[PDB]
Structures are given as C-alpha cells and as structure tokens.
Amino acid sequence: ASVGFKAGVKDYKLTYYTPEYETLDTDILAAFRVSPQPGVPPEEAGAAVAAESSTGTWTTVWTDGLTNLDRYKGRCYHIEPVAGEENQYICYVAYPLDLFEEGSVTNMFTSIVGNVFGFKALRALRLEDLRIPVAYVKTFQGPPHGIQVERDKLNKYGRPLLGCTIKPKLGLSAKNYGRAVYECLRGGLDFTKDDENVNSQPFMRWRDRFLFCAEALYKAQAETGEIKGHYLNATAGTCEDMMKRAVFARELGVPIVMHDYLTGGFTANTTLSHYCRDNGLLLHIHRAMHAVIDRQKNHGMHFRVLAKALRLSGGDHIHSGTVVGKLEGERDITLGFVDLLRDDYTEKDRSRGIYFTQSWVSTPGVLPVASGGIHVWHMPALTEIFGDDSVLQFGGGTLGHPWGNAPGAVANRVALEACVQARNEGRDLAREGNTIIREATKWSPELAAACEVWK
Amino acid sequence: ASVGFKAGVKDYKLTYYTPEYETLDTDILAAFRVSPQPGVPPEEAGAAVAAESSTGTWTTVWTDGLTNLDRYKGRCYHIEPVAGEENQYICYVAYPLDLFEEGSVTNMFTSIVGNVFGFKALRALRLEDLRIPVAYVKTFQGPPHGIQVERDKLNKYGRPLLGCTIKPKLGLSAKNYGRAVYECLRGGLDFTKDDENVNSQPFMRWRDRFLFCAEALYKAQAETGEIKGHYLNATAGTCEDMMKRAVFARELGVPIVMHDYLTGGFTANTTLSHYCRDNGLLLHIHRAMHAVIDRQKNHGMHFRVLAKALRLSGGDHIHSGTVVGKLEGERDITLGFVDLLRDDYTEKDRSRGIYFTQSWVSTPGVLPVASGGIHVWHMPALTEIFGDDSVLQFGGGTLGHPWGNAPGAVANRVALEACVQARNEGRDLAREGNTIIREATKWSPELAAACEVWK
Amino acid sequence: LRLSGGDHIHSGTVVGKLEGERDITLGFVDLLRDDYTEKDRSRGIYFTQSWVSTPGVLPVASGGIHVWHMPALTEIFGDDSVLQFGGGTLGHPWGNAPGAVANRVALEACVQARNEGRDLAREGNTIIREATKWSPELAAACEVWK
Amino acid sequence: MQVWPILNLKKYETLSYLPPLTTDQLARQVDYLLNNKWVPCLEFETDHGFVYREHHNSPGYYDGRYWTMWKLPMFGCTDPAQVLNELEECKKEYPNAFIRIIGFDSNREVQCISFIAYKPAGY
Amino acid sequence: MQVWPILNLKKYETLSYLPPLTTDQLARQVDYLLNNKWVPCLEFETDHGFVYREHHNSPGYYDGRYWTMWKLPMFGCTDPAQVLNELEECKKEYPNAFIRIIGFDSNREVQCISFIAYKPAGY
Ligand SMILES: O=C(COP(=O)(O)O)[C@H](O)[C@H](O)COP(=O)(O)O
Numbered sequence A, B: 001a002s003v004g005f006k007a008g009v010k011d012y013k014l015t016y017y018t019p020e021y022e023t024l025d026t027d028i029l030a031a032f033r034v035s036p037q038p039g040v041p042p043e044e045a046g047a048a049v050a051a052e053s054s055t056g057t058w059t060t061v062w063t064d065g066l067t068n069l070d071r072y073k074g075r076c077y078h079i080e081p082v083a084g085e086e087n088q089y090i091c092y093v094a095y096p097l098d099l100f101e102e103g104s105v106t107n108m109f110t111s112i113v114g115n116v117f118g119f120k121a122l123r124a125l126r127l128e129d130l131r132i133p134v135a136y137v138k139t140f141q142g143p144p145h146g147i148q149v150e151r152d153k154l155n156k157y158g159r160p161l162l163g164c165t166i167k168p169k170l171g172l173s174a175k176n177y178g179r180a181v182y183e184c185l186r187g188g189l190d191f192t193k194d195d196e197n198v199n200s201q202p203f204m205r206w207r208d209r210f211l212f213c214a215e216a217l218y219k220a221q222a223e224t225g226e227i228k229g230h231y232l233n234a235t236a237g238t239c240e241d242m243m244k245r246a247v248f249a250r251e252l253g254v255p256i257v258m259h260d261y262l263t264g265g266f267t268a269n270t271t272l273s274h275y276c277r278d279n280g281l282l283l284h285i286h287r288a289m290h291a292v293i294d295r296q297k298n299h300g301m302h303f304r305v306l307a308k309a310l311r312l313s314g315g316d317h318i319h320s321g322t323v324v325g326k327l328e329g330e331r332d333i334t335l336g337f338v339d340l341l342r343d344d345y346t347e348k349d350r351s352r353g354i355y356f357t358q359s360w361v362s363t364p365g366v367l368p369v370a371s372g373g374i375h376v377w378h379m380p381a382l383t384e385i386f387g388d389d390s391v392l393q394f395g396g397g398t399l400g401h402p403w404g405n406a407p408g409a410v411a412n413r414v415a416l417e418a419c420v421q422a423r424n425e426g427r428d429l430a431r432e433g434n435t436i437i438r439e440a441t442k443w444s445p446e447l448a449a450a451c452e453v454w455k
Numbered sequence C: 001l002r003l004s005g006g007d008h009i010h011s012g013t014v015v016g017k018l019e020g021e022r023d024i025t026l027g028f029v030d031l032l033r034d035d036y037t038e039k040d041r042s043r044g045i046y047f048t049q050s051w052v053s054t055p056g057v058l059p060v061a062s063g064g065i066h067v068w069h070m071p072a073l074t075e076i077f078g079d080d081s082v083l084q085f086g087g088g089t090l091g092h093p094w095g096n097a098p099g100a101v102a103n104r105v106a107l108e109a110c111v112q113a114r115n116e117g118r119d120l121a122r123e124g125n126t127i128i129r130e131a132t133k134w135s136p137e138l139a140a141a142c143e144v145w146k
Numbered sequence D, E: 001m002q003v004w005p006i007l008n009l010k011k012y013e014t015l016s017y018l019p020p021l022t023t024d025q026l027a028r029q030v031d032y033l034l035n036n037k038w039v040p041c042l043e044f045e046t047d048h049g050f051v052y053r054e055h056h057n058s059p060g061y062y063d064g065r066y067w068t069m070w071k072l073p074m075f076g077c078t079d080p081a082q083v084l085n086e087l088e089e090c091k092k093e094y095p096n097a098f099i100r101i102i103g104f105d106s107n108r109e110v111q112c113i114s115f116i117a118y119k120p121a122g123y
C-alpha cells in the first residue's frame, strides 16, 4: 500500500509472513502442503504462497499508494513441518472476506488456487483444506434440497438408499437401456443411474433416453409401490443445452437429474443447482475428473476441498468413493470429509485430515454416494462405515447377478435390510457381518445366488 | 459384447491391448504417460488405461450381449518406454468417434479423463496429447473470430499486440481503476486487462468497472487515433450472471471480454464463445488454475491438451506463459503448443512434445498471450520466439515505470517497434537484441528511463 | 417469385442469343414488371395475366457483359432494370473504381443519346466511342474488351 | 520525469512510434515484403487519417479503417524502387493525404502489413 | 493508370458522370420529357445537395432526398424554352443553390426523372 514511489523489484518475506496474526471469523483460511525448492526456507515459501495468491507483484507499482493493500493481502500466519517428509510444510494462509464475489465458487477458486501452483520457488503445492467463514457461507444457496428434505420427499427412512449404474455405458439403445432400468428398480433399488459419460451420443440421443427411462421408472414404481428415481444426466456442452435437458426432466415430473460438476464446471453447476431448487428437482453430482487433481499427495487439491465447494454451489448427492479396499487413515480421511458434507459443525481433527473447524449455519447436508466395485459382501462394512445417510451404488454388483437385474436388485435390498435389522437389534456389523449375510441366504435364494458368485 | 452369460469377474488384458490395431481417421487418439504400480507389466497397464476409460467393467454383466462392445471399446494399440525413467511408458489409446457428444469439450474430457486417473494399478497418470479427428473438429465452432479476423477488426498489422494488467488487482475503486486504464492505453498499448480475480467484489462492483473502463478506453482511442480495448472480465458464479456481463459489454460497443475458462468451466465457456461470435465480441481467455493440473510431469494433463480444448470450445486469445526464464526443451515444448494453437496443420514432432499430427480443417487459430515478469529487455527475445502473432502483456512492466503508466506504455511500444524494424531490416534479434534496445534509448527518454530500472 | 415476393430477380442477358429467345425474355420481363400482359404466343405468353396492382419486380441482367453491351442492354431492358457487371468491373486494368466509372459513363452516354433521339440499335458503338474521347476510364475498358 | 504529450499526438499503428523512416529505411521495409513474397500496395486518405465512429457503434465496428487504394497491389514487383516511385507519384498527386504502404500475403490470404509512409505537413 | 479522385467528387445521380450539359443538350433532355407527356418541374437546394442521415437510421430512411420545389410542376408546358426560362429565374434567385430538373409521369403516377441542371461555383 501507499508510497514515496521509486520503481524497482523489492522483496516479499516481511509483508506476507505474519506469524503473529490473529485470524478473523470473516477470513477464508487455507492449509497448503508446501514443498519448496532446495534452498528456499519455509518462512520464505509460506510468504510466497500468500503473496502469489493475493497482492504480491514482481516489481513495485505506483498504484498501491491509492489503497491500503494491507486490508487486501493474503497472510501466511503459521507454518508447521510435515512428519516423515523432508522439506515439506503445512502453511496456513488467511484471505480477507472482501477478496471474494458472493455466491461464486468460481471466484473463490480463481482467487486462492488460480495462480500459486506455478510459482518457481515451489517444487509442488497441494491445497488440503479451506475454512469457509459463515458470513461467506450465507451468500450461497447450498444444496437444492439436502438430506432431510430428500428423505421426506421420497418417504425413505432408516437405511442407506440404493442405486445401480446402467452398463454398458455406451452401446445400448435408449429402449434397451430403459428395459434394464425397469428390471433394476422393480427388484428393490431406489435409483438407477446414467453413467457420467452418457450425455447425448449417436446411438442414444438424450431425449429418447429420458423418455424411455421415464416409462421404465413409472412402471417399476406402480409395480412395487415404492418411489423410484433415475439420475438423468443433464451434463452438456453449453448452458443452454444443459437447461433444455433439465426442463424436459421437469416436464416428465421425474424426481432427480445429474451433473458432472468438474467437467461441466462450477458456473454451470450453480445455474443447474438454482434451477433444481426452483423446480423441486433433486440433483445427483458425479465427480468425474477428480483424480486428475486430488490423487497425488504432493500436488493438486485434496477432495475435501472439492466437496466443500460442491456443498456451497449445490448438490443433493455427491460421490465419495468406497472405504473398502483401503487401510485405516484413508478410511479416517474419508469419514472426515463425509462429516464435512453432512454435518452442521465439524471440529478440527488432524487425525482425519480436518485442518479447520467448519460451521455451516444450517446449510443442508449432502448425501455421500459409495460406488466402485462393491457387491453384497461389503454390505455390513458399508452400513457400518457410512451409516444410514448414504447412497450405496451397485453397477456390476447388480447387472452381474446370474439371474438378472431384478434378482440382482433383490439380493442387494435384502442384504442391506438384513444388516440394518441386525444393527438395530444390537448386533456388531464389524464382527458379525458375514454371519448376518449367511443367515439371510437361508431364506433368500436371490441373495444366496449372489453370495455364490462373489467373494 | 455378446454372451452365453455366466456371471463373474474375468480379466482385461486380452481385449484392450491391441498392438495390431490400425487407427481410423475418425478415432480420437490419446497419448498417456503411464507409471504402473510395481509388478504391473506395461501391456497390463496400457490395457487397464483403455478399459478404464471406456467399456471395462469389474464383473461380467449380461447386457453386453445386447450390443457389439468392440465397436465402442477404447484400445491400447501401442506402448513405448520413456527414456530416463524406470517403469514409465507412453501408451497410445484409440477411442471411436461414436463415444462423443458433438461440440462438447465437456463430454470429451469426461469420457477420456473422467475415470482412469484413480485406477489403483497405476501409481500416476498424465494425459500428454490428443489427436482430434477432423470429423469431430467440424462439430465445434472454434474461436469466435481468430487471428486473421481479429487483426482485420482492429486494423493492427505486422507486430505483436501489447497489453497491460491493471494492478493492484483488488483495492482500487472503479474510477481509479479506469484512470490507470486510460493512462496505459494513451501511451501506446493496445489493450489493458482485468486480473483473473476481478469479477464483482465489495469495493468494485462489475458494472461500475465496465462503465469507467469504457470512458477511459474511448478517451485513449480518441487521443491516439488507434483502436483500443480492455479485457472486461465476465467470469461469474452462474451462467446468468456471466451473460449479464457480456450483454452490458455489447451495449457499450466495446471490442473484447474475458473469461477464466477453467474456473468458470467448459460448459459456460462454450456458451460465452457462441455469444461472442453472434455479437462480434473478441474473447480473451485466462488460464487460471492450469498449474493445479499441468505442472507435474507424472500426473495431470499437459497444457497442450487444455489448449486444444480451448481452441475447440472457443477463445480468440489464450495465455501460454513466457518462454523466458527456462531452458531449451521447455522452450521447444511451448513453441510446440503455440503451433498447435495458431496453425492449420501440425506434423508429429516428439522433440516439441507433439505426439500426433493434428489438422484443424480451417478452424481459426488462437493468439497466444505471453505474460509474467516481463519488461523491456525481454522484447527482442519475445519477438523472436513468438513472432508477430502474439500478445505481449506487461503488468508490473508498465505500472512499475518511474514516470507512470503512459511513459511506461511508450517505453514498451517503442522497444517493440525498434525490434520489429530491426528484424525487418534483417538484424538478428537473438544476437543483437540488447544493442537494438540501447540504440532506441538514445532517442527515447521513456525507454531509457525504463532500461535504467530493469535488468 | 412475384407472388411470394422479391424486389429484383435475375432474368439472364438477352445478349448472345437469337431473336425468339430474345422475344421470350422480353415476354417474361413484361410479366415481372407490368400490371397487365395480354396473351402473345410469339413471346411465349400463353395467357393474359392481370396483377391487380401487385408491384412489379426489377429484372437483373447478368452474365459475361461489359461496356460494349451497354447500348443493347439499355435498348432491350429500358430504364427499369439492374445491369450487373462482375468480371466486367473487377476485370478493368486500372481497378474497381475506374472499372465502375467506365460502366457508369458508358450507361449515362447511352441514356443521354437515347433521350436525344439517337438510335441505340444502330448507333451504339458510335455512342460508346465518342464517350471514350473524354473518358480515359471508358477508353481503357474499351481497349480490353471486344 | 517527462509527461507524455496530449495534443497532436495521433499515431498510425505499426512503426509510427519510431522517428520517421528515411528513404533507405523505407526501402528496407519494402524489401522485407518482397523477400517474403508479399504483395505491396499503397493507400491514401485525405479526410480522417484516424479511426472514428459515425455510421454504427456495435462491437468491432469502426469507420476510418478503410482508406483508398492507390492504383492496384503491385503483383510481380521485384524492386523496392518501383514501390518508392509510386509513393512519389502519390505524394505528387495528394500532398495533403496520409499515405501508407500495406502488403498482402496471398498464401495466408490476408492483408498482413501496414505502415505510414507519408504524413502531410504538421502531423 | 489513373486513380479516381477522392476530394470534391460528389455526384448527383443521372447524367452527373457526363460533362455538364450545354443549353442545347439541356433543351434536348427537356424535349424528351415533353415528348413522353411527362410534367417538368424544378427543385433547388442551398444547404446539403447530397444524401445524409440525421433524423433516423432505419433501412430506407435517408435525409437530403427531398429538395424544395421551385414554383409548381409545369402542367401543359409545351415548349422547352418555358422550362429553361424558369431555370434562369431560379438561378437568378438562388445562384448558390443546386438546381435539378425532375419530371412526373401522371400515368405511372410517379416522379420519373431527375437530373442536375445547375451546380453552384466550385462543384
Ligand atoms: O461407474 C461407476 C461404478 O460401477 P460399478 O458399480 O460397476 O463399480 C462409478 O461411476 C465410479 O465407481 C465412480 O468413480 P469415483 O468413486 O472415483 O467418483
């Protein structure tokens, strides 16, 4: 800020490393995992991250004297070494509320993550967590409906919801696709789903798919008496095409649409979220492309950050991966962002990867969706790990059943209900899971058939 | 495809590794840099990448028999070791034209990159290049205007265009912001620019900024007689807000708007691109967030892929970084994607990171924008490296001049014209750059003043 | 087209063809411009046609024409026509502007002559040549064509 | 610290911020065109040598961009002297006009260069 | 190769690209009207003798098309001399105005001719 000009380069460090700073409740806080280049000390790196994601300029400019830049700068207020990693630190940065456009996740990401990742003084950089202050949270709509309202609309209580992705994703005609949908739903699954890739393509145009899927879902609902849904993928090339798709779903009176928020983008996602709220449509969010960004530990953005952003922009469901096939810690990390998606308040907990205490001031929670190579035998585990408020999705786990989709669905619905009943009776799912499943096979031929095929 | 069902897991390998495959001119080809987990052989990894980005399922499903899945599968048709890297290979994958929605970059990325990056058999994965077949290229609008039309609209020929980012990005009031804009333009720069972060914020709402920037640019144009522009940032939280911003720019009769395509997203970007074509607005694209994805060599997506996608979705300018401060090779890689952005045809050239020959069937070229810590002394280099068809942007390099914005602008415009004249006279910019600049200081006090401050 | 609507319509050139085809063209030209055209088999008009004040359409003569056809075109089509010169303009040795001047002068010379009572059919070439005496642009064009 | 002038400081795009070209410099710029196989052509304007907006105001629309062609592009021209002779004929005829040399690249199929070669007195 | 002039080369439609009409030529054009039973009339303009757009810009709208009538159309006129005498009275009164002769065809019910008969000095 201010001047007595005299052009020239100058140095960051003293200006952006403010270890004495007391954060304001209105500040957006970021926890960056910084891997500096050799020779760059930690304080220097932290200061660079702050300067490079806010007001740092490479050479002094006279206009800084027309404002008070201190009021606008990002500040590295804390640094701590990462255990078991040489030259790697967690740097905490505070950003003033005034830097951000209200209600715009697009602007939030552009400001924090738009520039710093390419800074030469850093070898690698990863955003691990963001503390979104409640005054900024209030500028967003959040989920169109959220957990509580969704269960009330669907009249489904006391158990995880169940879905199934139709496969093969490409190749089936709209009608054969709908046939698969009806056979799956009539067996007891609550939802069926379009693959993230299924938008509108040569062998299956979107309108034809939406139309046959509607016929299939209404027929399954009339047969079973339970409310059904099919995630109709509205992801498209332009905002106009996406809206056309959402509008037809509305015309059909169906309950839920879907959007690939990362490939579609936050600007389009927020538009669709607002439309769903205004029209009573549930919105299922698929996280396609997330691993391009969140997989590597040293660079990118951890998924918990992409999950908070989605809760703000808006979605009623969001894919959170399976906790299956991974060790504790990764199990703990998942449970950690699951709390961040569902709860109103989550206290800081480094054992679960939660760097900041986060409050949501009544913004609705998002239902996490467990998907990926799961079948009947993982049921006790999934129920134990996620609890009731989750959607368990079985693609191959349903369409791979030897007797077909309907029995495949029955097997999954019976397996889930057996676990819920057992848990409610006080049985230990963690210890007695396999026994609970086996007992159910005694009276369920469908379940017994499935158990024979898998694991 | 087809069956004689019998449920159960099964194995990829034979099905997705097709080393004998002859690619079709209609196929979309991908070059992935694959780092398999220890113990996974290359053929196995390549087959996994193909299966996991197309039809591979974890367990056999009966519906595959209702189609001919061979017609829809991705195929790993070639694998080659990466030199100087253990257990790292380049796997080539072919995707049939039919898997993609016409005109949708959103669907192209979802299909190729939406799922594979999280596959456990891989340690890391990076998409290096895509060969977009001309039949798919024809389904996109491409740039609203492109290089040739832009120069004709602006009446600017035979030299790189010049711009300047207004700083500080946040803190100035709309009016002081416009004052900076007028002082920069009147000195000889063609464009001024909103920082990627400047959308609409508490101290400077968008409409006020657009309005004062219009007054400033018209005043600078009337004074100099040369056409001027200011990249008005239209990036917003929803499609509706973005459109409102573009519409006001149209009402003002100004020539160019801006969009952060990655943080805004491809769906919103394609909408804005179509609007710009229909309304005669040039579109400057900022690549905020790119380094989150393209920086690390072992994981993510190389920028050349993000640049091809933008040329399809649409943009008239796109930031391509500076070639300054880096060794050859990185210089060669940049020149390689620069050709991919501007030319109609680029032959395969591994020395420049071009894995596939690419044709554009007359889709307009995109102007690359060099930006980032540059000043008058880099002028000969930039002119030599980029040639005439580029935009050179100087933020600190202009607002950091000791006499102010206008003289800062004059210094840059004189420095550029001195280099252009010299090159045209047959002088070697690479060898005589510093001498060309020094001679100009003899008659340009503004340039002499700048030369004293920097390097 | 006169019913659906158009203000101009291409009717071909009468140049390069024998009478009869010349008569047929003049016949549909009347059908495009006039309010009433009586049956006339010598011109290919099989029915008497009335238009009850529906506006006439301007015929457009186009196709391989240049300055030398000017007297002929003016004679055949009269004032209510559009004469189009593509190669006849962009093909002029000094460029488009002089190419345009040559055509405008050639046309005005013919109109003035006709108005003075000169016979375009008999004196066309003489009318053009006299204009070249004072129009370098026209003289340049006359040298290039026919 | 010098203040960039405000009055009579109108510019004419490429090369207009440099001191006016000498005949030798002018000839060297013309040789650049020829060596690149670009077709030289001259344009002149007597009224407004700068951009303005009279007939419309929508994005990308400006008046004053087109000037008038002096003769025709110089196809086959192989000598910078030919071009400069024409600049002389043009100046002889329009001493009150701004004259600029432009070039066309028939391969890129576009006008590709434009630089002021003559400014009337007091400009 | 001559370059078509740019300055002071405003035209006035029909017959304006020919050398100015002599009194005999002028009389011959007037006889053309009379022989066709068209009614001659004179119009003059002192301000802008050319088309412009001040009051509106929609398609087909232009200002400067209407000039002011000198007296009334010359119904029953049978002698070119009458018309030319009027041109003289008009010039006497408005030596600074552009004067044109127009004709009306009462059968086609439309104005049918228009040619400049007098241009003030330096036009
Ligand atoms: O198609 C499927 C699963 O099919 P199946 O049920 O047959 O495994 C899901 O989209 C992905 O698992 C999601 O990926 P992510 O969880 O990484 O978002």
Ligand SMILES: O=C(COP(=O)(O)O)[C@H](O)[C@H](O)COP(=O)(O)O
Residues within 6 Å of the ligand: A057, A058, A118, B165, B195, B196, B287, B288, B319, B320, B321, B322, B371, B372, B373, B374, B393, B394, B395, B396, B397
């Ligand atoms: O603000 C600036 C430069 O300001 P200055 O001219 O003062 O350096 C640009 O947005 C970035 O350099 C672009 O980043 P990238 O090139 O990585 O897209």
Ligand SMILES: O=C(COP(=O)(O)O)[C@H](O)[C@H](O)COP(=O)(O)O
Residues within 6 Å of the ligand: C010, C011, C012, C013, C062, C063, C064, C065, C084, C085, C086, C087, C088
């Ligand atoms: O392009 C031209 C003529 O160019 P040029 O003036 O150089 O001959 C016209 O469109 C055709 O002659 C019309 O055809 P038709 O008269 O059969 O409709």
Ligand SMILES: [Ca+2]
Residues within 6 Å of the ligand: A165, A195, A196, A197
């Ligand atoms: Ca899927």
Ligand SMILES: [Ca+2]
Residues within 6 Å of the ligand: B165, B195, B196, B197
């Ligand atoms: Ca910037």
